[PDB]
Amino acid sequence: GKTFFGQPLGLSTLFMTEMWERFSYYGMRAILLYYMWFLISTGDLHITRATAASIMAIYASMVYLSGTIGGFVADRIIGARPAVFWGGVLIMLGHIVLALPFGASALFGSIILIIIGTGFLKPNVSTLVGTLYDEHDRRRDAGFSIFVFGINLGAFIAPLIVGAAQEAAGYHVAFSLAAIGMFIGLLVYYFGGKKTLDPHYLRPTDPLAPEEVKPLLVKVSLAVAGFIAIIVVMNLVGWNSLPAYINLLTIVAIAIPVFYFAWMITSTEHLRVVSYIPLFIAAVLFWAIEEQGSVVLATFAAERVDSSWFPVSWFQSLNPLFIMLYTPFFAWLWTAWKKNQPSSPTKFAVGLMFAGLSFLLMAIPGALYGTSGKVSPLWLVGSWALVILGEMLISMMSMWFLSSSVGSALNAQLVTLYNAKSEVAYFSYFGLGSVVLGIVLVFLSKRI
Ligand SMILES: CCCCCCC/C=C/CCCCCC(=O)OC[C@@H](O)CO
Ligand SMILES: CCCCCCC/C=C\CCCCCC(=O)OC[C@@H](O)CO
Ligand SMILES: CCCCCCC/C=C\CCCCCC(=O)OC[C@@H](O)CO
Ligand SMILES: CCCCCCC/C=C\CCCCCC(=O)OC[C@@H](O)CO
Ligand SMILES: CCCCCCC/C=C\CCCCCC(=O)OC[C@@H](O)CO
Ligand SMILES: CCCCCCC/C=C\CCCCCC(=O)OC[C@@H](O)CO
Ligand SMILES: CCCCCCC/C=C\CCCCCC(=O)OC[C@@H](O)CO
Ligand SMILES: CCCCCCC/C=C\CCCCCC(=O)OC[C@@H](O)CO
Ligand SMILES: CCCCCCC/C=C\CCCCCC(=O)OC[C@@H](O)CO
Ligand SMILES: CCCCCCC/C=C\CCCCCC(=O)OC[C@@H](O)CO
Ligand SMILES: CCCCCCC/C=C\CCCCCC(=O)OC[C@@H](O)CO
Ligand SMILES: CCCCCCC/C=C\CCCCCC(=O)OC[C@@H](O)CO
Ligand SMILES: CCCCCCC/C=C\CCCCCC(=O)OC[C@@H](O)CO
Ligand SMILES: CCCCCCC/C=C\CCCCCC(=O)OC[C@@H](O)CO
Ligand SMILES: CCCCCCC/C=C\CCCCCC(=O)OC[C@@H](O)CO
Ligand SMILES: CCCCCCC/C=C\CCCCCC(=O)OC[C@@H](O)CO
Ligand SMILES: CCCCCCC/C=C\CCCCCC(=O)OC[C@@H](O)CO
Ligand SMILES: CCCCCCC/C=C\CCCCCC(=O)OC[C@@H](O)CO
Ligand SMILES: CCCCCCC/C=C\CCCCCC(=O)OC[C@@H](O)CO
Ligand SMILES: CCCCCCC/C=C\CCCCCC(=O)OC[C@@H](O)CO
Ligand SMILES: CCCCCCC/C=C\CCCCCC(=O)OC[C@@H](O)CO
Ligand SMILES: N[C@@H](Cc1ccccc1)C(=O)O
């Protein structure tokens, strides 16, 4: 009977939904940094480019931090399917804001909306993929890999389309294309959802019991009150610049996993919990490097590469393109190597080494040719090829979302150090350290 690549037909609906959401997001991010440079150039937005680069990073960090609680809100309060729909609506509006005839003023509002929207939609659409299968079903792992392919397909075509559009018709038109993308996603999700998805997920699957509401309400209130108290104090002492607020967001994001580990520490498994701290750190650093591709490598693409024959934002398509191209080989590998099954601990270690190699590679063109000229595009092609090899190896969801969020929070401080004069040193040292720490994990691997 009829399937979607051997899978339940509902997967097709979820496939397209997340593909288009990812289209809207990565299409936006492929030109967002350049947009801020533009606003800076016209004098409309008073920050340095270092700060603009910092904003791209903490933006990404908040988006995934939002996703750490999205599953909770859906499962306990509003339902997974409404979470996805209304999350999509918030994302679309966020994009519409940037298409409207405003400048810097629209930036904050657009970002907030998308942070909130993605937090609702992203974990829950992935959760919905699991709902197509029973606990028992074998196909479950194949389904998610297809889902991941869709994620990268959307991520792949968006820079091409949106980038071309910005150069031809301008930023507002381009941003509107991103909005249209999310809209298309909503249409297919809504009508395809009604046809192909279990109505059980129109409502929360674990609703709050009567005695759970008040303590939850206390919990969120204290967290919000405390967060706001700090902002009050920050203004009192004069720590009120945008870099100061970004520093606040970095800390909060980093504090969360620290506080989590630090007091959820029977000798049976205090060790076992402590065993995964190296694997979390490894993921954090790899995602840090991978996420800099839309910031540091995006800067290198615009400034240091001679690609005068197509929009420079197209370079953002290389990351997901390599994911798709690698899928065939890695599919073969996991089938073919039945015995091998290398450990998650060294998978993380090797993946980190590739990411560190990808940066060491980028140190070479500046070392060889100097930094005042322009080099071949294949340097970036080579850099993406290396880092994506790591990703294939690396591939709770909250914890996954957390790892990425922490990496991007780290980037928000690191990417400010990147500039023309720093270029080689930047790449050589953050590249080298990643290889070393990757190898350090190779010592403590089964000392675990
Ligand atoms: C999606 C981005 C893929 C980038 C792949 C680029 C592969 C091409 C590398 C050769 C570029 C060297 C110089 C560029 C070029 O051929 O045209 C420029 C020159 O003809 C000016 O008239
Ligand atoms: C207007 C602000 C936009 C919202 C920013 C995103 C939300 C920020 C902080 C809430 C995250 C709370 C983290 C607690 C949590 O359960 O997630 C981590 C959990 O997996 C621990 O392992
Ligand atoms: C419509 C208003 C938009 C903002 C509302 C949605 C903001 C996100 C969450 C609101 C508080 C939910 C509490 C999240 C939480 O308790 O995390 C649970 C944690 O244990 C994760 O497993
Ligand atoms: C700016 C846009 C404002 C909102 C426009 C869309 C609102 C119109 C009707 C509300 C539809 C509610 C759908 C919520 C939902 O759970 O849909 C889930 C989907 O799977 C339907 O089966
Ligand atoms: C518990 C709540 C966690 C708080 C998380 C804070 C997330 C809210 C906003 C983050 C936005 C990222 C930076 C956006 C930004 O600086 O753009 C505004 C600026 O360009 C306008 O001059
Ligand atoms: C290079 C981009 C075009 C490649 C073909 C894209 C065609 C779009 C959808 C059809 C493929 C969707 C399923 C993807 C897929 O079969 O992945 C294979 C592997 O991941 C098995 O899970
Ligand atoms: C379906 C409703 C949500 C989806 C978005 C629909 C709106 C998207 C495009 C409609 C036209 C956008 C306006 C484009 C625009 O005016 O910017 C270009 C112009 O301002 C620059 O000179
Ligand atoms: C100026 C640009 C337009 C600003 C307002 C845009 C609002 C237009 C459409 C919102 C999209 C609604 C979500 C699409 C959808 O599938 O809902 C259909 C469902 O409600 C049918 O009952
Ligand atoms: C912070 C943004 C304001 C929007 C409200 C977010 C509320 C976040 C946390 C408090 C959750 C308590 C309300 C839960 C609720 O609606 O109960 C419904 C049902 O489960 C009662 O049994
Ligand atoms: C969930 C907490 C809600 C508290 C409402 C107030 C939180 C406001 C902002 C959250 C952090 C973003 C700070 C970015 C910002 O406002 O930039 C300020 C900048 O204009 C200084 O010149
Ligand atoms: C939960 C108890 C609260 C304890 C204090 C919470 C954390 C204390 C301070 C947060 C640091 C805020 C960011 C620091 C900052 O503003 O940087 C200043 C510097 O950039 C000058 O603009
Ligand atoms: C007793 C609690 C465990 C031991 C304390 C561990 C400290 C917990 C959280 C610290 C947050 C990490 C610092 C954030 C950070 O590195 O950013 C630095 C920068 O943003 C400051 O301007
Ligand atoms: C799959 C293997 C790919 C290997 C790519 C990485 C190659 C390993 C190391 C690259 C060396 C970069 C160091 C650059 C350097 O020496 O700095 C030069 C500096 O003195 C001039 O400013
Ligand atoms: C996992 C498999 C990875 C194998 C990749 C092997 C990588 C080999 C060399 C990478 C370093 C790049 C060499 C630098 C280079 O080619 O510059 C010379 C070029 O400018 C010629 O004019
Ligand atoms: C498996 C590695 C493939 C080959 C990668 C070898 C990378 C090592 C060095 C790259 C050459 C660096 C450029 C030459 C260089 O920096 O000379 C020093 C010069 O800056 C002094 O003025
Ligand atoms: C599927 C590939 C995985 C391994 C990729 C490793 C590639 C490492 C280096 C290749 C790119 C660096 C050399 C690029 C290069 O040759 O510069 C272009 C040269 O023609 C100067 O114009
Ligand atoms: C044959 C099928 C398996 C393919 C194995 C993957 C091949 C590994 C690396 C390919 C990247 C090319 C190496 C980069 C390179 O040598 O550039 C040299 C360039 O400077 C020549 O002018
Ligand atoms: C278990 C949680 C993992 C935490 C991993 C994060 C590592 C801890 C702190 C990172 C702080 C990085 C600060 C780097 C720095 O200050 O330099 C950049 C600064 O110049 C920005 O202008
Ligand atoms: C156990 C010894 C460490 C083994 C790590 C293996 C990493 C492979 C190649 C690393 C090449 C180092 C590149 C030279 C370097 O980093 O100098 C920094 C210089 O570029 C300053 O800008
Ligand atoms: C153990 C977890 C490590 C996570 C944080 C790793 C990065 C933290 C700090 C590195 C930046 C501190 C300053 C180092 C530095 O000078 O690098 C910049 C330099 O390469 C540019 O000239
Ligand atoms: C400067 C020389 C550059 C080349 C250095 C790269 C190779 C150097 C060290 C890699 C081997 C580290 C030893 C890993 C090891 O076997 O430790 C034991 C571990 O397997 C048990 O978990
Ligand atoms: N490239 C990934 C980034 C990511 C990693 C982990 C969690 C969430 C997002 C994606 O678009 O899905």
CSV table of C-alpha atoms and ligand atoms in Angstrom, one decimal, residues 306 322 325-326 354 357-358 361-362 364-365 368-369 374-387 389, ligand 16:
chain,number,residue,atom,x,y,z
A,306,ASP,CA,36.2,36.3,-5.3
A,322,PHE,CA,26.9,18.2,2.1
A,325,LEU,CA,25.3,14.2,-0.4
A,326,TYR,CA,26.7,12.4,2.6
A,354,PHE,CA,36.7,17.3,11.8
A,357,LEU,CA,40.3,20.6,11.0
A,358,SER,CA,37.7,22.7,9.0
A,361,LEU,CA,42.0,24.6,6.7
A,362,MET,CA,40.6,28.2,6.7
A,364,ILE,CA,45.8,28.4,5.3
A,365,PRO,CA,44.6,30.8,2.6
A,368,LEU,CA,49.7,31.6,2.1
A,369,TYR,CA,48.2,34.6,0.2
A,374,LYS,CA,40.6,37.5,-2.3
A,375,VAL,CA,40.9,33.7,-2.5
A,376,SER,CA,39.2,30.8,-4.2
A,377,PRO,CA,35.6,29.8,-3.1
A,378,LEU,CA,36.8,26.1,-2.8
A,379,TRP,CA,38.4,27.0,0.5
A,380,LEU,CA,35.0,27.4,2.0
A,381,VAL,CA,33.8,24.4,0.0
A,382,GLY,CA,36.6,22.4,1.7
A,383,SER,CA,35.8,23.8,5.1
A,384,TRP,CA,32.1,22.9,4.9
A,385,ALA,CA,33.0,19.4,3.6
A,386,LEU,CA,35.1,18.8,6.7
A,387,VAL,CA,32.7,20.2,9.3
A,389,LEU,CA,31.6,15.1,8.2
B,16,LIG,C1,34.1,15.2,0.6
B,16,LIG,C2,35.3,16.0,1.0
B,16,LIG,C3,35.7,15.7,2.4
B,16,LIG,C4,37.1,16.2,2.7
B,16,LIG,C5,37.3,17.6,2.2
B,16,LIG,C6,38.7,18.1,2.6
B,16,LIG,C7,39.0,19.2,1.6
B,16,LIG,C8,40.2,19.9,2.1
B,16,LIG,C9,40.8,20.9,1.3
B,16,LIG,C10,40.1,21.2,0.0
B,16,LIG,C11,39.9,22.7,-0.1
B,16,LIG,C12,41.2,23.4,0.2
B,16,LIG,C13,42.0,23.6,-1.1
B,16,LIG,C14,41.1,24.5,-1.9
B,16,LIG,C15,42.0,24.9,-3.1
B,16,LIG,O1,42.6,24.1,-3.8
B,16,LIG,O2,42.1,26.3,-3.4
B,16,LIG,C16,41.7,26.6,-4.8
B,16,LIG,C17,42.9,26.8,-5.6
B,16,LIG,O3,42.5,26.4,-7.0
B,16,LIG,C18,43.3,28.2,-5.6
B,16,LIG,O4,42.5,28.9,-6.6
